[PDB]
Design a protein around this nucleic acid. Sequence first.
RNA 1: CUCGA
DNA 2: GCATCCGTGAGTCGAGG
DNA 3: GTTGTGGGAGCTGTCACGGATGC
Lengths: 1092, 93, 426, 293, 94
Amino acid sequence: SSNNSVPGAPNRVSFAKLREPLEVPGLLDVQTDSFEWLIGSPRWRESAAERGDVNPVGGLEEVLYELSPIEDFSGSMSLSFSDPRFDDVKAPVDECKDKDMTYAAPLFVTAEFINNNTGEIKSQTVFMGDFPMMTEKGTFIINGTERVVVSQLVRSPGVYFDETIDKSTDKTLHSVKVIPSRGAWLEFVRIDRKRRQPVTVLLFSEIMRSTKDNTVGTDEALLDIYRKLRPGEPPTKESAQTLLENLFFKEKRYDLARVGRYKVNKKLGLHTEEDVVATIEYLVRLHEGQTTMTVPGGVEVPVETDDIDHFGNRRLRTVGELIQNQIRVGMSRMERVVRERMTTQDVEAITPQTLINIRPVVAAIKEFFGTSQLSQFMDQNNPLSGLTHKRRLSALGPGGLSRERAGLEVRDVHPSHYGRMCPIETPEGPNIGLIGSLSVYARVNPFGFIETPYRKVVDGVVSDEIVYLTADEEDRHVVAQANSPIDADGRFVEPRVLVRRKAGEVEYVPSSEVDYMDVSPRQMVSVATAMIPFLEHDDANRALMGANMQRQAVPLVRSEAPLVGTGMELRAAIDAGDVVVAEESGVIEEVSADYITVMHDNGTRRTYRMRKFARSNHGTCANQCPIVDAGDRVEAGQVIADGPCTDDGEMALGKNLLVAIMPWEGHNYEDAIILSNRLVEEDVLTSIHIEEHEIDARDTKLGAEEITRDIPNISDEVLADLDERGIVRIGAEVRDGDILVGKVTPKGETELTPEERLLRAIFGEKAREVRDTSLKVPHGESGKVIGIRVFSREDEDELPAGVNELVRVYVAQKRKISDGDKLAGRHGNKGVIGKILPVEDMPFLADGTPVDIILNTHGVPRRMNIGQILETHLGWCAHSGWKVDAAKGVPDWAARLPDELLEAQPNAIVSTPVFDGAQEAELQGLLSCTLPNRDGDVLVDADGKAMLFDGRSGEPFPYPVTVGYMYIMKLHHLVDDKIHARSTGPYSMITQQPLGGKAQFGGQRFGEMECWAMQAYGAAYTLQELLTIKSDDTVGRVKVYEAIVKGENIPEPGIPESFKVLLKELQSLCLNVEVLSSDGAAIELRLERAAA
Amino acid sequence: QITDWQLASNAEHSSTGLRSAEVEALEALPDTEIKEALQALPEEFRMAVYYADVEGFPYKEIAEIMDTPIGTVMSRLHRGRRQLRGLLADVAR
Amino acid sequence: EFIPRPVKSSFREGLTVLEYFINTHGARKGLADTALRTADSGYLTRRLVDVSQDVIVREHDCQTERGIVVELAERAPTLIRDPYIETSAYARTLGTDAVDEAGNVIVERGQDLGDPEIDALLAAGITQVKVRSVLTCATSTGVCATCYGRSMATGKLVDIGEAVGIVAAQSIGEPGTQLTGGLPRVQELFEARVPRGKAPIADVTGRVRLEDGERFYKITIVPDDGGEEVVYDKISKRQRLRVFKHEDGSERVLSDGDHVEVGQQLMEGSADPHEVLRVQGPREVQIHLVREVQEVYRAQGVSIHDKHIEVIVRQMLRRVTIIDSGSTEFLPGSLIDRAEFEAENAAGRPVLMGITKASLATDSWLSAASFQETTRVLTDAAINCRSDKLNGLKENVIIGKLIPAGTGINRYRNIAVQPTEEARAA
Amino acid sequence: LKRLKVVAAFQQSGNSPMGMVLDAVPVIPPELRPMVQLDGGRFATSDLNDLYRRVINRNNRLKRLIDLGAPEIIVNNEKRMLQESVDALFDNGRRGRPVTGPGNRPLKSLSDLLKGKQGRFRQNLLGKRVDYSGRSVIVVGPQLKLHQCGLPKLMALELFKPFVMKRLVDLNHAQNIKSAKRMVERQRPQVWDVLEEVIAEHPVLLNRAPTLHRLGIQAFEPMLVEGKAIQLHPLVCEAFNADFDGDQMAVHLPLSAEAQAEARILMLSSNNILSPASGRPLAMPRLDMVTGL
Amino acid sequence: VNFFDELRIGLATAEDIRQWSYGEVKKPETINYRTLKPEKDGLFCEKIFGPTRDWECYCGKYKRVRFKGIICERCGVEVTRAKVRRERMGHIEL
RNA sequence: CUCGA
DNA sequence: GCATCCGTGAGTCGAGG
DNA sequence: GTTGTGGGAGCTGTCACGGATGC
Ligand SMILES: [Mg+2]
Ligand SMILES: [Zn+2]
Ligand SMILES: [Zn+2]
């Protein structure tokens, strides 16, 4: 009973027992609505009219109003910007990806210049730059790569009070801090890293009367600030006055926030100096401890210390606002030169275009999108990756805290996160607690505060009027729970109800005391987390791991929706934006492996091009396939084609495998996994991986490289797959080592070997003298050449300086599941494949059906994730189908929930939502009435177990084993990517040690702790060898190779080059270091074989 | 710090790449083909082709170090170049 | 802290929404806490490695007759097993022949003290033993094999080239990530920092006088030798009094007028190890430090053999501080090695120093520069025109020479081997 | 006492305190502060070069000012700037605000090259990257002997590449040594047989990080395995704290005779059954084995 | 031979600093943007630090192993292995 | 920067 | 007479771009 | 050769410790 809203969406029967009173909002709205505010689109106009005041202003309109008008110091001239308009887009998205461009639109504005003494008003339309644009999917394209702007967590402007304890006698010491929208701050009156500031030396009070302060008049407090914060200059009477007037009263310097001003006026008074008086009164009357406070003109404020992690005092700046702030920076940097040109030039001859240099705004936008920590390479292993990435909230970055100045209380789950930031989905590693994901139903508001929806309660009556509350508004109310008994008409059945109050604590209050109720369970969860069946049965560690590992599934050649899922797979796949969706209801007029054309009813034609075998940012294969047939009538929103990890419109991150839970000969020891070789023969876990090799011919000192099929002394047979250009041919199968693009690089004459010198002399060779710098395929890689793209400087192809030609070979490979690959269930139950057994010796059921995967029993109980077991049971139920016996009534176990679950055909699609859905009793009931197989044999008994035969000896295993169907994902951690060895390779020019990294054919690092270990063994010679002739001895290593090749003993080791380099660095530090003999001076460091 | 990615990517366009211990040690070994092709010629004309082609001396210095006139040196040069191109023409390719 | 409302559900019944919510607190807090604990354990292991890596075996036996007494049992009318024979008695080498009063010689000096030996000693009624440790070892440079005893891995007598120092650092650091009063206390000990809650101790035997006041504990000892009376400052009521005043008296809390011996703790808590150094002697500071450190690792299920902690503690006392230079060029108040101070001989008093400080004060400026505070080390080395003998194993690693340990020892690396005549014949 | 330590060092060392003031700065060889160009024609250089450039520019400006006999205040400003720039070049950030490049990154001064976990000492002297080494993910091999481990064919072929080339020239599969190299690189079927010969009784070291105690590095005899994964004997897992949830391990090939001997005798898995810290046994049945028995 | 006995430090006197040096750098210029060649008397000058290419001088009149150790007079760049570029220090006169 | 043990 | 202000520590090994 | 008006970005949620410095 789910997915009824989405047309054509398959029928996934749901065990849920609660009505869904609110659908999932646009799971990308967090990004879109933000950008649509920034731009001022009609969408945002209507959305603000529906839930906002009558005077809306977009991000750019606001920036312009703030900047206007650029005025001369004498007030003689004034420049005013207005009416931000966009042209159409320069190039489409796929075009920008192909050409390595930046999807953007030209920005235009009306610039009105006025000379106050000539009356001349020359209006003009000025162009501000190529403003980068947000795509349908909510991303950006910069330099041809797709990027996401992750929302940032930061402290909203305002004043905040806290209560510390002094090291004197544990006295309760109050402190305050004022965080501004822009400018400096202060504390208590210490200001700008200058302590020892009496609060009374700058202007019933308990200690305000005690201030100690010795002065009278206004010049003392005016001169003390210039003598205490503006040093390096004598004490003056005018400069201190000027600075004090330009500190906080001045609006140019000190930017009073809008959100900040709202928060502060809510903290002190409905309607600056008033604020400072209220703040002093607040600190005083907080040192006392009184409940409320009365300020002149303001009233009704609770005297209380503020929580720094509360979501009513912690906001997030969406993409729109980050862009707005970068634009403000560029605009101020431009206004500087605008005034600086107003000064010099003559009036009546300066047009808006003459004094407006946009270079700083362009550079600001560019630097933001290209260097900000919040513009991130889009995680697109699969649709769920990108969907969560867009909805993500991180606290690091410019303007937030530091990855090292962020302690542990920052990373703690605050009670105000309920329904706003999911508490499960967060990284396990260093970034833990710092990167969360937006809750499913959550929604950002104009001020950057995360609101969440609740059903209104009128006289213990759950209504259908929904209301969105922020953390503050919520705290001030009593929120019922979603799984609260309610009779029709919205009436709590129980005398009282469980609820949450402001203290972050729960209570059991009479029904007439409830204000709002949760819209649904799982309201606190994120999208990924909401997709773990039987979540409540899993510990938070393994559940966090399950979410994180769902975001790592690799798309498989053929995708299969989970036999048992939540209700979120469909909506997740759709919002993610990797499936094609019918924008307008019509009739399929044509369908091909290439495109899909629908004829709308009003005669309109719309066509959709299928992404076919597209490489993703992480090598996964984005490949769409249509799921409509010619003549099919499709409604608006219906899914037209499946994406990479989707099936009929549902997130299909893995496959349904026949699992047996039992230790099998140790091959699944200590988390290993055993797979049936079927999964290889039938490609059940096979995936496609597309890599992009690139190579350019550029200008060198000795000339210019040339991409040529003619490479020095290469066998005609080796080039057999190269075209005339020296580029491999499409569809060619390339093993590791083959050539991909031939290239020669001008070589100097001094480098020619003596052999080559004589060869070019005797045979009268030419003066080419090049080196083979051709692009070869790296180790552990192979595949068919999917594609070839090429860019020539000859043609009108734009490339960097000195780069003549540039070719890119796109190579695909089909990876079969293999030993070493990493699989995992949705319950944080990960493991590498220990062995892939022949189907014949796999344990099999009575009917010869061999299991597909053997999961070691010893791994389940201690991890506290029996969720996988419940899933196995329900999955077998769904794979066999069932029929609850209704004759003589409906059994009590199936009475509560089951409505259309009383029977189900084999391979039925069922969803068990989190915190609702399948109950243990109902699971057991279904397990009792399993349907039989072909021969009318019930294979899995009422415990969920079944006898199995040892496919090796033939004898049956003595005890029944739990067999079932489990959803297993192929996580993007594959041996093919991680195997790496090296005998000898490139070294670093600085340390002369082996390069690091597989991509560079590097060597393993023998770290300090490894040398400790080696010493503990007493393996002196092994440690020396590892550290001298394998790393740094520039002659020792070549000697070692020469000795191995000629069957001679390994020579004695020399001197690590890194030591010479250390000596050189010391010397450069003016330290005279010197190596000495037993009794001698400093030792110094620094043909016949060739002639032979 | 310039990265290993940057170092290797630079070597991808340089006159000499980041060489291996293997490459060095094998370079140190003798090229049997050309060594055999040289050992065929009379060690006088071959010593001349050495002092003239491998080392690049001027013909006057070759006459000096050979203790022979210039004409003999250059005639040995011509004859030896002809011979070795004969034996090393199919080898050069 | 703990939430006054518990998780009444089992993860089989499925947790209610709010139960799952509250449980995430613990889950995530624990994940982050392990993240930090691993780094702290790592830094402590690194400092141990540095302060101890120059400690290798060099002789088979120093022949010393010093050692430590280990309890092997306690008697109650049948004998209990000594609580931690596993870590302090087992795997030692017996210093003095242990014979049962009115019995045969059960175990000979210089034996392994394995399971059979301990069992025989216990059956014969041997309630205690005296063993040889590196604490009381007499060798000059490092430790002798016999003072160290069995090699925990090989089960035999440690070989003459072992790097027992690094193995001790590892044995002590590897279980670090199990410490959940904890790892902080282990560091407070190994670094020899005046403890947070300082529990003063009796400076000399005598009679005690307590004085009560409003949060004011005032103690005064009248010495039995008649010297001046030792007055200890007032202590807040937070420190309850120690629970042994039993010299033929009250085997209970300290009461005014009790007889206090010299090395008796006065009030519950931890005691300053420097105070015990100056009051009871260095061989007592070693015992106290080893036991205190072992306490933490024992309260967590971690059996670290005492000999490792002794290998570490040894390197904290190798130096003395010179009060009056006297006839020598040693500046006063400077930390000088004990042998460098004995040979030259000079008011040299023992001194305890933490592993970090002990390490930064080594004779190899290269080692110090590579360990920590590179800038200061290098500047002082340049000023003092220091010269590194290139003798520590870390130094040789840096320069690419065979480390002086295991197969790097001179006797081992220069072995000559020729086939015998009888074999050369056939 | 404090102010005496330094004066006495300067006295007894023969180091004239005059050194503490410099009239000439030393410039480190260019190879130790390299310069390269990346994809895009742009150039990358070591911070050093930029600090040296600032020092040299300000020095030339001071010379030009001294020649132009400018006001004493201007020349004093230039001298202060020169002192500050040399301080940056030496220990940037130590005094005043650090010198920043693009992005406000404090440039790595000459002192930064010696300090830290990633400085010269800890990062390049106490541990380095080595040849004849590899990495890959580990999976349990139950059929293994405690003294055995399974190496992927390709891994072993790459590690022993010189050995296999030598045995390929011994036999007449390859004409010369260059041809033996080309053959081993193409993976010609002749190599495989030869490979199993070279690997005979040739130990290899396996390591898993973090290396907490020495058992974190253990020696094994390798046997060729089908796949691209390292097979690890289960009993040793305890020693490595290794479970097969995806961790990987590194392989090192001892070359010298003494190295192979240390691997066979000192670090052989079979010889390291017991915990060097407690004497208890580690290579002991752990979970499944236990239940089985 | 890796058998040193001791290693010693000491503050360097300007005399030591100049004895070390192979020439003083004078200009901020590093390399010619066009020819990718080290500007002379700059932080990459080959006259003092060393030759970029084996046995090749700056101007080019000398490029062959025939004359090793020769000191070119046109541009004053020793003709030796470029390895020395890692071991030849410069200096600046304050 | 993110991620794996 | 010391109270602050600063300067030093804070796990290892792996992968992309 | 420079001749009308002129203070910038950066932390900025870390902690625990030991010893010059500085009033
Ligand atoms: Mg693991
Ligand atoms: Zn001894
Ligand atoms: Zn020249």
